Write a protein that binds this DNA or RNA. Structure first.
Ligand SMILES: [Mg+2]
Lengths: 1212, 134
DNA sequence: AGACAAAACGACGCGTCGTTTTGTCTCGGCTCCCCGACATTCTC
């Protein structure tokens, strides 16, 4: 009669758990436990995952990893360039002096930043290439622009000069490094598209719009004409923005089968779309008919104020850089003998690949050009193999014994669907699946046209020659037509018909000059393996030519036949090749069927079936179904189901049902759970924490014994993903092994719905206990706003009801503003029996009498529900006003990470490339160390700086938000003067003054506002701020980068006390936390500089008790008699800064009204969190709070005598 | 620039006679006002009471005199125990030696002096051990 | 009367509790693996 009930309510980040011990029959019962577990993440994620925008920190970590990896690969390229050029004796003496070539191969010596051209002598810097500089000045003078130009402009003059003249070796090394800097866009696959590939960015003018007579939506659509004689493919309605409008389009032209250009159009905007910019710059480079370096040099000659980097050339095809570098190297090659000395070439090859003699042998046949271009600079690695991530066959396994003496199973990767084996399998499955019907009588016309084996033989031979069939072709195969018959499948749908073999047949037909028998099983499977394995252009054409050589076919039309084969779609079947190959013989019929091709085991099972003898591997259902399989010849035309069983002896996947016996099974299941095994991280975290919580409640309340949970009720209240998964997982514990409970979920698992819970909460007065509990918050807001609009009196109940004004009722719910609503939901779910859910889900009775018994058993006389026990409501009050909310914490600062790297190791007298593990210790920081924006330190005489703070300046765009106060915050005084003059000139209106047009006007007339003095244009200015910014690092130039602490990284707040008694506070930032945890110490120092002993540390989501003003809590403890006044004085930390700590009462989830700077009102002021209590005393929490510790079930943990014994009982 | 710490050995060789050279080098080492731990003074007291059977009054007078004039005591760092456990994983030393190195390190000492404890061995790449009598 | 102890003056001057307001790295191309849901056929 007594039943233990676990009710669970599942939210986005909330688990509401309740455990109750019920006698419904005797109208008794009591709550044993209730609680709510909360996983903190900001409401940004809550509003984002509904729509989806990179909602994963894993993705952000991956993005940072990829950016870093690209950075080190650029570094490695430059590094190999240093090594090779130093071998070639090309780097200058002053430069190469400061690169290590012995221990750090090619790296700069530490704390040095050399530049290739700027030679430093006695603290002065001088240019190195004076003659080329003078030549470029002569070129500019011939162009007649100026005579004062930057020295570092010489690179483009040299790049133009390298095309057709001799330059010194140092400039060539400089040019090579510059090319390494700027590589260009490039797609790995390539696969050059349609030969025209028009894709031409053009600017066209609309001439006229003739009303096309296409009256659509009460308006006749117009066509568009262009000066070149072209018509816009689409029509237009808006006349005003299309007449004589200089529009720029991206257009694609394709030569149609008729012999005319099938031209397309696509509106695109320059300087705003990446494709348009890329195409326009590419066309400007080509139309100039010269290398991009010379194009840049000419554009800099004509407009010497041109911004190259990021403005003129942003992104161009890698082919441009490749051709330019090739021309440079080849034309420098005939002048420099160092580029022909094969001694030096072998020296470089040995230096770069000393441990790879194969690669040396390869590149000994090349020259310097191939090494520099194809190997060092433009070397792009291929994509990593995802083959190891391919799924596994569910039937075929393999077992082997390792070095540990255990017997573990490898797996068989599934078959690619493009494999002809799986093609023939799908075709056979369909052929057994096909059945014809007539249109007239809708009768089963089968068994007349396809009854004998010859008919199916002809059907299969017919289906082999095509790739995909329709209604028409399948009907016409049998001479039937549309008007009388239907084929039981979707009438207008096409179904796969072995595309692989048929398309191979077409390509082998086009080559000709061969006998019409070269296409067999062996050849088809081979060429499929070649065309599937080698997905790389040059390798693929090699393989095709080699196939055309080995097999006696001409390699003049066959490669043309197969060079433009569209690659296979990435998809794999449910089974592996071994399983499919084993299964194929049984689905065979007629001539393609034979008993000889069936393996030993399946033939033995066939003999056992036909004989009728008794085997343990054969079930009664088998002979029940295989009664017609009297003779071995009956093993023809067997479908997937029968053949699958006969091969593997299992009636498909019958599942394992399973039964967990103790908490050990659950905890093992939790230990073996794999990351990223579900839809998204949110539901995975929810499920994992739910499993942890149920394990904890099992241990605490039933001590892991068998069948302690009589029943589990589950509910959620997008999120539907966990509705079935959690029920399936938890079915193991409340299942019954007697055989009555069989199915996907245990019959004890009883999901509900919102209707039941809301009808209950209304009918139980639970809404009343809830609003009585929440009313004091609304009373506080009423007294804060000095109104009476937040509480509404009622006479039907004669009390004040919570309410909100309509202007603050944007998205209000009374229920979502607390955390123990989850506990309410769990409790109401738990007490809802299967009778309740059946009654409220199948209220339609068809007869009053049949469901009247449930009414009398459950309804009060159908008005309200009768109490599970008389004390239910007040007991619920007592329970819910006595709940601690437990908040999960993420204080990961450092953790261990293992690094594996390929390297050549000497074993058994041979160098072998194997994977080495990193030596020494190396930690991984698990928090973003600081913010992305980087500022530089400045010293301003006209600003007074307080001690302990510094001035940091960052560049910002001069825009409309620059008013007088902000204009006074630019570090430049002359810029301040000019901007003041301009702002005064525009009547003190930055919006008109600092519009882009206004910025242009100021730039054109800079004399008018600089007191007549000349000055360079202004678009960005360095604004300075006064505060506390710390250096990013200490090496090189990282000591000049000043940043701010990242969001959510002030994780520890130290509270110390001095001998007399005052409390001192400190906010300890993540840096010294990092090196303290690295030195094995505690996160926070245990004493401050004054020597005050540390009371304790606070972290976000911590819990403290704030005692009354009269209580003296010094050595209280005694945290078992937590009554309601004690529990209402529990505050959770929210954030921390300086010496300030902000708290929110632990039972608050959402503030009824947030803070808006206009009305200047809020539940907890501006910060939405208070440094003090909400109650009338308004006492600083940090001066009297005492830290506490709760478990997952929210039970306080404190020192006891058993604990003090066990501390060193464990060590004894 | 360096912060010199010392161990019980230097004081013990300073006090004894039969090792005139050791006593000498110890007394010059005390001239540079080398820093000391509170531990090192504690084992100094213990060894004077056990090995040398000196009475309590004279022992306390001598330790007060030395702490006032010759050696400079260093505060007992509160992280001495966690940090001593840190070196326990990587270093093979008696636990008292691990504590003396822990408190020397946590007080920004760079060089420690003693006969024992693996001459010339750098501890956590921040402290060195030098046998000075050699 | 002497000469020490400390209160008083100064403009100056910088710190300090309590709250509010402000600022916070951005976009492009693809490839290939896995999973989820929803439709049809087929076996049990
Ligand atoms: Mg010792």
């Amino acid at each position: 009669m007594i039943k233990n009930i676990l009710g669970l309510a599942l939210g986005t980040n909330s688990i509401g758990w309740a455990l109750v011990k019920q006698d419904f029959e005797n109208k008794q019962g009591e709550i044993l436990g209730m609680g709510s577990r909360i996983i903190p993440m900001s409401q940004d994620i809550l509003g984002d995952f509904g729509k989806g925008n990179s909602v994963s920190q894993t993705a952000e970590r991956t993005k940072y990893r990829s950016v870093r990896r690209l950075r080190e690969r650029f570094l490695l390229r430059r590094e190999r360039l240093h090594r090779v050029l130093y071998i070639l004796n090309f780097l200058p003496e002053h430069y190469a002096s400061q690169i290590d070539f012995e221990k750090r191969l090619g790296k700069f010596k530490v704390e040095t930043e050399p530049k290739l051209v700027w030679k430093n002598t006695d603290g002065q810097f001088s240019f190195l290439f004076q003659n080329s500089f003078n030549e470029m000045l002569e070129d500019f003078k011939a162009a007649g622009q100026e005579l004062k130009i930057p020295y570092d402009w010489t690179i483009y003059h040299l790049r133009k000069k390298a095309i057709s003249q001799k330059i010194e070796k140092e400039e060539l090394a400089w040019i090579l490094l510059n090319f390494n800097h700027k590589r260009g866009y490039y797609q790995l696959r390539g696969e050059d598209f349609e030969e025209e590939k028009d894709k031409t960015f053009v600017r066209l003018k609309v001439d006229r719009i003739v009303d096309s007579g296409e009256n659509v939506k009460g308006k006749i659509l117009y066509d568009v004409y262009f000066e070149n004689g072209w018509k816009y493919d689409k029509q237009v309605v808006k006349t005003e923005d299309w007449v004589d409008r200089t529009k720029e389009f991206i257009v694609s032209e394709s030569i149609l089968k008729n012999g005319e250009t099938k031209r397309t159009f696509k509106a695109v905007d320059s300087e705003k779309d990446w494709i348009a910019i890329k195409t326009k710059t590419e066309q400007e480079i080509e139309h100039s008919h010269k290398t991009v370096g010379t194009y840049i040099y000419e554009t800099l000659l004509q407009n010497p104020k041109q911004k190259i980097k990021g403005k003129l050339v942003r992104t161009i095809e890698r082919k441009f850089y490749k051709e330019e570098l090739r021309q440079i190297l080849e034309k420098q090659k005939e002048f420099h003998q160092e580029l022909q000395s094969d001694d030096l070439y072998n020296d470089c090859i040995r230096e770069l690949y000393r441990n790879n003699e194969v690669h040396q042998l390869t590149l000994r046949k090349k020259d310097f050009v191939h090494l520099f271009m194809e190997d060092i600079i433009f070397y792009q690695r291929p994509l990593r193999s995802q083959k190891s991530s391919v799924s596994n066959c569910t039937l075929e396994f393999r077992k082997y014994k390792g070095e540990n003496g255990a017997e573990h199973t490898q797996y068989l990767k599934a078959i690619p669907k493009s494999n002809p084996y799986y093609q023939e399998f799908r075709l056979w499955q369909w052929i057994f699946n096909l059945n014809l019907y007539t249109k007239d009588n809708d009768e089963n016309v089968t068994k007349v046209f396809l009854n004998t084996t010859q008919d199916f033989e002809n059907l299969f031979e017919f289906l082999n020659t095509r790739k995909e069939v329709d209604q028409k072709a399948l009907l016409k195969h049998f001479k039937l037509n549309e008007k009388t018959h239907r084929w039981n499948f979707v009438e207008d749908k096409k179904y796969p018909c072995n595309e692989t073999k048929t398309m191979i047949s077409s390509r082998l037909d086009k080559v000709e000059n061969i006998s019409d028998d070269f296409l067999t099983r062996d050849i088809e499977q081979k060429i499929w393996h070649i065309i599937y394995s080698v997905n790389d252009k040059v390798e693929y054409e090699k393989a095709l030519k080699s196939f055309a050589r080995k097999h006696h076919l001409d390699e003049s039309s066959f490669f043309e036949a197969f060079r433009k084969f569209p690659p296979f779609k990435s998809e794999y079947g449910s089974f592996s090749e071994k399983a499919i190959k084993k299964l194929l013989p049984l689905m065979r019929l007629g001539k393609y069927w034979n008993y000889a091709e069936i393996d030993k085991y399946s033939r033995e099972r066939i003999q056992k079936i036909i004989t009728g003898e008794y085997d343990e591997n054969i079930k009664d259902k088998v002979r029940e179904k295989s009664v017609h399989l009297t003779i071995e010849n009956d093993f023809q035309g067997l479908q997937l189901w029968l053949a699958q069983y006969i091969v593997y002896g299992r009636h498909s996947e019958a599942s394992m049902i399973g039964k967990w016996n103790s908490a050990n099974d659950l905890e093992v299941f939790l230990k073996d759970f794999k990351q990223h095994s579900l839809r998204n991280p949110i539901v995975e975290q929810v499920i994992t924490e739910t499993l942890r919580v149920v394990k904890d409640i099992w241990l605490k309340y039933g001590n892991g014994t068998k069948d302690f949970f009589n029943e589990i009720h589950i509910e959620l209240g997008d999120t539907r993903y966990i509705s079935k998964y959690i029920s399936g997982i938890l079915s193991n514990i409340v299942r019954v092994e007697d055989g009555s409970d069989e199915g996907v979920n245990s019959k004890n698992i009883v999901p509900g719905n919102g209707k039941i819970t809301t009808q209950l909460k209304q009918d139980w007065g639970l809404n009343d206990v809830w609003n009585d509990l929440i009313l004091p918050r609304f009373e506080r807001m009423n007294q804060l706003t000095n109104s009476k609009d937040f509480t509404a009196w009622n006479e039907n109940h004669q009390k004040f009801l919570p309410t909100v004004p309509i202007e603050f009722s944007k998205g209000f719910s009374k229920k979502r503003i607390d955390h123990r609503h989850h506990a309410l939901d769990a409790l109401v779910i738990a007490c809802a029996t299967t009778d309740h859910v059946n009654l409220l889900n199948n209220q339609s009775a068809k007869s009053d009498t049949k469901r009247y018994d449930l009414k009398k058993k459950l309804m009060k006389f159908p008005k309200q529900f009768l109490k599970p026990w008389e004390k239910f409501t007040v007991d619920a009050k007592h329970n819910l006003e006595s709940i601690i909310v437990s908040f999960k914490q993420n204080l990961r600062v450092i953790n261990k990470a293992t690094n594996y790297y390929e390297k050549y190791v000497e074993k058994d007298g041979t160098k072998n490339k194997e994977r080495v593990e990193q030596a020494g210790t190396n930690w991984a920081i698990r928090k973003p160390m600081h913010k992305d924006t980087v500022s530089g330190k400045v010293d301003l005489p006209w600003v007074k700086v307080p001690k302990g703070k510094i001035l940091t300046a960052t560049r910002k765009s001069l825009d409309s938000s620059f008013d007088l106060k902000s204009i006074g915050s630019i570090t430049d005084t002359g810029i301040q003067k000019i901007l003041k003059n301009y702002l005064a000139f525009k009547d003190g209106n930055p919006e008109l003054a600092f519009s882009p047009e206004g910025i242009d006007d100021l730039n054109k007339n800079i004399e008018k506002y600089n007191d007549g003095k000349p000055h360079q244009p202004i678009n960005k200015v360095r604004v300075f701020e006064l505060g506390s910014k710390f250096q990013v690092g200490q090496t090189g130039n990282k000591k000049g980068k000043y940043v701010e602490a990242a969001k959510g990284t002030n994780l520890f707040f130290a509270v110390y006390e001095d001998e007399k008694g005052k409390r001192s506070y400190e906010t300890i930032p993540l840096n010294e936390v990092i090196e303290r945890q690295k030195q094995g110490l505690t996160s926070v120092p245990l004493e401050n500089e004054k020597g005050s002993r540390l009371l304790f540390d606070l972290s976000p989501n911590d819990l403290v008790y704030v005692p009354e003003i009269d209580e003296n809590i010094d050595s209280n403890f005694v945290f078992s008699n937590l009554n309601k006044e004690k529990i209402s004085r529990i505050y959770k930390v929210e954030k921390t800064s300086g010496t300030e700590c902000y708290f929110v009462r632990q039972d608050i989830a959402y503030l009824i009204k947030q803070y808006d700077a206009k009305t200047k009102i809020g539940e907890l002021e501006s910060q939405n969190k208070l440094q003090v209590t909400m109650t009338d005393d308004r006492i600083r929490i940090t001066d009297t709070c005492v830290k506490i510790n709760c478990d997952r079930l929210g039970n306080i943990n404190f020192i006891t005598k058993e604990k003090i014994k066990q501390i060193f009982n464990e060590f004894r | 620039l360096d912060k010199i710490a010392i161990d019980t050995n230097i004081l013990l060789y300073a006090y004894d006679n039969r090792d005139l050279d050791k006593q000498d080098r110890a007394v010059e080492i005390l001239l540079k006002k080398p820093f000391v731990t509170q531990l090192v003074v504690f084992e100094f007291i213990k060894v004077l009471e056990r090995r040398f059977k000196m009475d309590k009054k004279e022992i306390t007078k001598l330790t007060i005199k030395l702490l006032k004039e010759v050696i400079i005591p260093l505060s007992l760092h509160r992280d001495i125990y966690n940090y001593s456990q840190f070196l326990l994983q990587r270093y093979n030393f008696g636990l008292s030696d691990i504590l003396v190195l822990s408190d020397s390190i946590l007080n920004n000492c760079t060089i420690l002096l003693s006969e024992d404890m693996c001459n010339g061995m750098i501890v956590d790449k921040k402290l060195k051990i030098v046998n000075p009598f050699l």
